[PDB]
Design an enzyme around this catalytic site. Structure first.
Site, PDB file in Angstrom:
ATOM      1  N   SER A   1     -39.165  30.026  48.453  1.00  8.85           N
ATOM      2  CA  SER A   1     -40.486  29.411  48.504  1.00  8.85           C
ATOM      3  C   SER A   1     -41.540  30.187  49.289  1.00  8.85           C
ATOM      4  O   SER A   1     -41.226  31.075  50.083  1.00  8.85           O
ATOM      5  CB  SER A   1     -40.366  28.002  49.092  1.00  8.85           C
TER       6      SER A   1
HETATM    7  N1  LIG Z   1     -29.653  17.836  42.923  1.00 14.38           N
HETATM    8  C1  LIG Z   1     -29.784  19.003  43.622  1.00 14.38           C
HETATM    9  N2  LIG Z   1     -29.234  19.130  45.055  1.00 14.38           N
HETATM   10  C2  LIG Z   1     -29.309  20.193  45.919  1.00 14.38           C
HETATM   11  N3  LIG Z   1     -29.979  21.335  45.341  1.00 14.38           N
HETATM   12  C3  LIG Z   1     -30.589  21.438  43.993  1.00 14.38           C
HETATM   13  C4  LIG Z   1     -30.573  20.180  43.016  1.00 14.38           C
HETATM   14  N4  LIG Z   1     -31.148  20.435  41.941  1.00 14.38           N
HETATM   15  C5  LIG Z   1     -31.548  21.699  42.158  1.00 14.38           C
HETATM   16  N5  LIG Z   1     -31.152  22.269  43.402  1.00 14.38           N
HETATM   17  C6  LIG Z   1     -31.526  23.615  43.825  1.00 14.38           C
HETATM   18  O1  LIG Z   1     -32.779  23.504  44.603  1.00 14.38           O
HETATM   19  C7  LIG Z   1     -33.124  24.986  44.725  1.00 14.38           C
HETATM   20  C8  LIG Z   1     -34.529  25.028  45.078  1.00 14.38           C
HETATM   21  S1  LIG Z   1     -35.122  26.796  45.253  1.00 14.38           S
HETATM   22  C9  LIG Z   1     -34.505  27.111  46.940  1.00 14.38           C
HETATM   23  C10 LIG Z   1     -35.517  26.893  48.176  1.00 14.38           C
HETATM   24  C11 LIG Z   1     -34.468  27.362  49.260  1.00 14.38           C
HETATM   25  N6  LIG Z   1     -34.929  26.392  50.439  1.00 14.38           N
HETATM   26  C12 LIG Z   1     -34.589  28.738  49.788  1.00 14.38           C
HETATM   27  O2  LIG Z   1     -35.036  29.000  50.863  1.00 14.38           O
HETATM   28  O3  LIG Z   1     -34.352  29.616  48.921  1.00 14.38           O
HETATM   29  C13 LIG Z   1     -32.461  25.949  43.558  1.00 14.38           C
HETATM   30  O4  LIG Z   1     -31.496  26.798  44.203  1.00 14.38           O
HETATM   31  C14 LIG Z   1     -31.668  24.867  42.899  1.00 14.38           C
HETATM   32  O5  LIG Z   1     -30.344  25.048  42.334  1.00 14.38           O
END
Ligand SMILES: Nc1ncnc2c1ncn2[C@@H]1O[C@H](CSCC[C@H](N)C(=O)O)[C@@H](O)[C@H]1O
Ligand SMILES: Nc1ncnc2c1ncn2[C@@H]1O[C@H](CSCC[C@H](N)C(=O)O)[C@@H](O)[C@H]1O
Ligand SMILES: [Cl-]
Ligand SMILES: [Cl-]
Ligand SMILES: [Cl-]
Ligand SMILES: [Cl-]
Ligand SMILES: [Cl-]
Ligand SMILES: [Cl-]
Ligand SMILES: [Cl-]
Ligand SMILES: [Cl-]
Ligand SMILES: [Cl-]
Ligand SMILES: [Cl-]
Lengths: 317, 316
Positions: B59
C-alpha cells in the site's frame, strides 16, 4: 316459548334472518338440567351442564344475536366457533349460515363436547361439526373461515385462527385482561398481516382453560437475557401495559413484575417507568403512537394486531 | 529513497515516532519482483507479488502512516492487521509498537502468507506473527487488541473483531460499499455495544476474498418468507441503502435488487420506495433519523454500528 324470545330479539333490533334462527332451535334440548320453559326462553344465561367437576353455560341470547349482527353473519358463511359447550349457539348459527354454510365448533371438555355432538345429531343438523380439543389450535382442515366466533374468555387470538381466517373475515372475541380483572370483547377484521379492530363491550363468559388461559405462563418461556439498554419514563403505565397485552400478546410476568418478552429485547414495566434490555423498537413505536393518541386507554383506540408483523395503534376518528 | 519518503511523511504532518518507522524497514525486501530503488520508495502502491494467478500489493506509505496516526498507534500496543500481504506494513507497524508491542497479521493466500513469514524471519523481526487464514475470524488468542488495522477492502467489520477489540480500542477500515462500489475508509472506536465512527476518506485496496468478500451471498441465506406489510416512499434511496449496508451489515441482493435481511422481516429496496415484508422497526428508525439528519450521505454522519444491538445514526 320461543316466540317470546324471538319477539324480544326483534325489540333489540336483531334482523329477521338472525332472529328467525333463534325461533327455529329448541334451546331446551341443549340443557342437561331441566328448567321451566318460561325460564328457558328468557334472555338470560343458563347452566347447561354441571356434574360437580365440569361446568358449561348457554350464553345470553341477545348477546349472541348482537355478536352475529356485528360480524355480519349471513347465508353461506363458514364459521369457527371457540367454546362450543353443549351446542346451542352453534345450532343457531347453523341456521343463520344455512344449508350451504358450515359451523365448526371446538369444545375442550370431552364430556361436554360429546353431549354437543349428540344434540346436533338428535336435531338432525348436518352443517355443524364439533371438534373435541383445545380451541387454541383451531381447526385447519375446514378453513378458510369467514368468521371466528369466540364464546369463552381467551388470553389472545392465536396465530392459528388468523391463518385460518379469510382476508376480510371477522373475529368477535372476549379477551381475558387478567391484570385488570376484566374481560373486554373486541370486533376485528382481517387485513393481512393484521387484525384491525375496536373494543365493543365488557362480557362475562367463562374463562378459558388450556392454552387459551395460560398465556402469561407460556410467554415466560419467550424471555431471554439481554444487557440493560436504558430506562424511559412511562405515564399511565397500567394503561400501556393493558395495550401491550392486547397488541403484542407477548406479555408475561415473573414475581409480579410484568415483562414484554420481545424477539430482540425485554421490556420490564414498572410504576410509571420501563426498563429496556436489548432492543425493543417496536415497543418504543407503540409508546409514540399511544402518546400521539392522547394516552387514551384501549377502549378508545383502533387496534392493529400484527401476525408475523409488529402491532400498532391508530386514532384517526 | 527512504530519506525522501520520510521527508514527505513529515511534510504531511505525520508524527516523528511513526514516520521514523519508515526509515527502519527496507521496503524492497518485501517485493518479490525487483524494482529500481528510486521507484521502491515513491509514495505509491507497488505490486509485491504476482505469479500470474495470485497477486498482492504494498500500500501507499503515506496512507498507511495516516492510518497509524488516526488510530493512535504507539509503543506497547497489540495490533491485529487484516490483509498482511508480503509483510511490509506489518513490519513498519512493528517498529511503531516497539519491542513490547505485537503485530498479529492475517493473510488469506497460503503462498503470500508463507512469503511474509520468510521475510520477517530473514530480517529478524520478532514481534510480528503472521497467520495464514481468513481475516474474517480475527485471532482470539492474542486479543484484546488496541487496534484492528485493515489493509484490504472488506464487506463488514465482523463481530469477531468487535469482541477481540478492547473497549476504547480503534478500527481503521476500508469498507466495500455494495451499491456505489467505492471503498470509503472509516475510523471507529469501541464503546460497547457499538463501534462509533466516521468516514475519513475514499481509498482503493484489493477487494477481500473469503468471508470478508461474500457478505451479500451469506445474507441471502438469512432471507425468510414474511407477509407483505407496507410500502414506504423515500427520496435519495441509494444514499439510504448505502447507510443500511454500513450500519446493519445485513444487505443482500437477488437479480440486482437489494434487500435488507432482517431478524423479523425483509425490506426490498426499489428506486423510489421500499417494501417491508414482516417487520423491520430498526430500519424504520434508521430512516427517521436519516431524514432528521438532512438526508445526507454517510460522509457527513456519525455511525453507531451495533453488535448484539441495532445500529443508529447521529449528526450532532
Ligand atoms: N479474507 C481475507 N483475510 C486476510 N487477508 C486477505 C482476505 N482477502 C484478501 N486478503 C489479502 O489482503 C491483501 C491486501 S494487499 C497487502 C497490504 C499488506 N498490509 C502489505 O503491507 O503488503 C492481499 O495479500 C490479499 O490476499
Ligand atoms: N381452551 C379451550 N377450548 C375450546 N373450548 C373451552 C376452552 N376452555 C374452555 N372452553 C369451553 O368454552 C365453553 C363456553 S360456555 C359454552 C358457550 C357455547 N357457545 C353454547 O352455546 O353453549 C365451556 O363449555 C368450556 O369448557
Ligand atoms: Cl412467577
Ligand atoms: Cl404466579
Ligand atoms: Cl429499544
Ligand atoms: Cl430505540
Ligand atoms: Cl413497528
Ligand atoms: Cl440517491
Ligand atoms: Cl439515483
Ligand atoms: Cl409496521
Ligand atoms: Cl438512528
Ligand atoms: Cl440515534
Amino acid at each position: 316459548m320461543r316466540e317470546k324470545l324471538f319477539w324480544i330479539l326483534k325489540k333489540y333490533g336483531v334482523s329477521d334472518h338472525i332472529a328467525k334462527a333463534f325461533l327455529e332451535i329448541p334451546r331446551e334440548e341443549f340443557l342437561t338440567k331441566s328448567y321451566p320453559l318460561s325460564y328457558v326462553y328468557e334472555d338470560i344465561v343458563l347452566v347447561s351442564y354441571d356434574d360437580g367437576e365440569e361446568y358449561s353455560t348457554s350464553s345470553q341470547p341477545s348477546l349472541m344475536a348482537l355478536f352475529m349482527e356485528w360480524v355480519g353473519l349471513d347465508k353461506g358463511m363458514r364459521v369457527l366457533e371457540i367454546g362450543g359447550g353443549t351446542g346451542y349457539n352453534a345450532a343457531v348459527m347453523s341456521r343463520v349460515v344455512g344449508e350451504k354454510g358450515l359451523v365448526v365448533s371446538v369444545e375442550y371438555s370431552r364430556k361436554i363436547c360429546e353431549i354437543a355432538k349428540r344434540n346436533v345429531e338428535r336435531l338432525g343438523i348436518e352443517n355443524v361439526i364439533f371438534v373435541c380439543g383445545d380451541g387454541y389450535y383451531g381447526v385447519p382442515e375446514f378453513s378458510p373461515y369467514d368468521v371466528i366466533f369466540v364464546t369463552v374468555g381467551v388470553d389472545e387470538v392465536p396465530e392459528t385462527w388468523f391463518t385460518q381466517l379469510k382476508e376480510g373475515g371477522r373475529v368477535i372475541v372476549p379477551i381475558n385482561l387478567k391484570l385488570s380483572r376484566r374481560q373486554p370483547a373486541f370486533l376485528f377484521k382481517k387485513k393481512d398481516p393484521y387484525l384491525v379492530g375496536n373494543y365493543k363491550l365488557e362480557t362475562r363468559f367463562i374463562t378459558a382453560g388450556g392454552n387459551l388461559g395460560n398465556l402469561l405462563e407460556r410467554n415466560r418461556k419467550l424471555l431471554r437475557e439481554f444487557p440493560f439498554n436504558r430506562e424511559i419514563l412511562l405515564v399511565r403505565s397500567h394503561i400501556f401495559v393493558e395495550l401491550v397485552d392486547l397488541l403484542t400478546r407477548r406479555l408475561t410476568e415473573i414475581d409480579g413484575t410484568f415483562y414484554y418478552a420481545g424477539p430482540n429485547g425485554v421490556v420490564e414495566f414498572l410504576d410509571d417507568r420501563m426498563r429496556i434490555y436489548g432492543d425493543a423498537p417496536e415497543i418504543e413505536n407503540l409508546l409514540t403512537q399511544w402518546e400521539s393518541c392522547g394516552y387514551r386507554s384501549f377502549e378508545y383506540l383502533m387496534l392493529h394486531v400484527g401476525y408475523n408483523a409488529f402491532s400498532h395503534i391508530s386514532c384517526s376518528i
